[PDB]
Amino acid sequence: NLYFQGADSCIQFTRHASDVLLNLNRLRSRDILTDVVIVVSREQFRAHKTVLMACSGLFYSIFTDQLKCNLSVINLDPEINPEGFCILLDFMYTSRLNLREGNIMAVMATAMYLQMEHVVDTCRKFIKASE
Amino acid sequence: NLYFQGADSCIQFTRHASDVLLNLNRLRSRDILTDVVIVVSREQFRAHKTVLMACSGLFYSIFTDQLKCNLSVINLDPEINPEGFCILLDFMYTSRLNLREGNIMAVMATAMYLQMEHVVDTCRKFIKASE
Ligand SMILES: Cn1c(=O)c2c(c3cc(Nc4ccnc(Cl)c4C#N)ccc31)N[C@@H](C1CC1)CCO2
Numbered sequence: 362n363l364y365f366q367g368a369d370s371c372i373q374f375t376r377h378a379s380d381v382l383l384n385l386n387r388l389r390s391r392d393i394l395t396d397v398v399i400v401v402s403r404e405q406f407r408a409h410k411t412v413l414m415a416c417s418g419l420f421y422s423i424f425t426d427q428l429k430c431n432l433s434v435i436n437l438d439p440e441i442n443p444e445g446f447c448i449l450l451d452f453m454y455t456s457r458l459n460l461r462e463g464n465i466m467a468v469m470a471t472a473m474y475l476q477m478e479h480v481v482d483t484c485r486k487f488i489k490a491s492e
Numbered sequence: 493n494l495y496f497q498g499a500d501s502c503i504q505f506t507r508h509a510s511d512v513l514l515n516l517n518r519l520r521s522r523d524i525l526t527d528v529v530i531v532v533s534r535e536q537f538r539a540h541k542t543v544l545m546a547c548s549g550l551f552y553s554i555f556t557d558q559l560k561c562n563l564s565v566i567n568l569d570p571e572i573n574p575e576g577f578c579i580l581l582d583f584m585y586t587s588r589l590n591l592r593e594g595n596i597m598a599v600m601a602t603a604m605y606l607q608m609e610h611v612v613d614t615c616r617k618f619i620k621a622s623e
Pocket residue numbers: 411414415416417418419421476477478479480507508511512515516518519
């Protein structure tokens with residue numbers, strides 16, 4: 362019931378990937394093995410570099426750079442809205458995007474900067490439905 | 493199409509968790525930001541501590557211990573079969589378990605040791621179907 366025959370030979374566990382992500386978000390909530398602080402304006406966000414790279418073209422580029430991969434603090438562009446970054450950071454660790462009329466422009470601009478392309482496309486579609 | 497209305501207010505992205513896990517497995521394949529070596533008998537396996545903790549009660553206990561969380565090399569019980577550990581390490585990063593008649597006893601014993609309880613239950617069910 363919790364597993365099935367995959368297209369390939371292996372048995373596959375249906376909820377495995379979502380349960381791993383839930384545990385990584387629990388580690389983040391408890392500040393366990395977090396290895397970077399992202400600073401956006403006056404706010405700081407602790408996270409795991411591997412989750413950030415897995416969820417963003419900008420962080421993938423930063424953490425694969427031989428000089429920047431060892432930095433413990435990353436400062437983002439001061440024009441980035443911290444609420445918009447917070448919504449996208451929660452999305453990275455949960456798959457859930459808290460998109461609302463009052464935050465959609467900041468979330469879209471932050472997703473463009475972070476290189477989260479399907480999030481940008483989704484924001485655009487929601488904006489287009491209003492116009 | 494790639495998203496839906498979650499039971500809660502947020503929109504949710506269907507493939508997000510499995511795509512994050514795919515990227516973490518790509519980082520492992522390329523040896524990027526791996527922070528531990530697990531030694532099983534004569535073999536070494538590089539991995540990310542966060543993925544190991546998220547997938548195992550034993551690694552969760554080790555990496556939350558104030559003394560052991562800083563270790564770069566973890567040596568497992570020499571009775572653990574490296575092929576069995578390799579199959580479970582691949583499962584952690586993919587959701588796919590390569591269970592076969594020739595490896596099921598080693599995979600089950602290694603999952604008991606690593607505290608991966610639904611994997612043990614699944615192994616037991618497959619063994620019971622043969623008897
Ligand atoms: C452009 N872009 C996205 O538009 C994007 C990304 C995204 C992720 C990456 N990282 C990688 C890519 C390839 N290979 C490796 Cl190893 C890595 C790593 N680490 C690079 C670019 C990415 N991740 C998604 C997550 C569901 C996967 C959310 C946001 O959308």
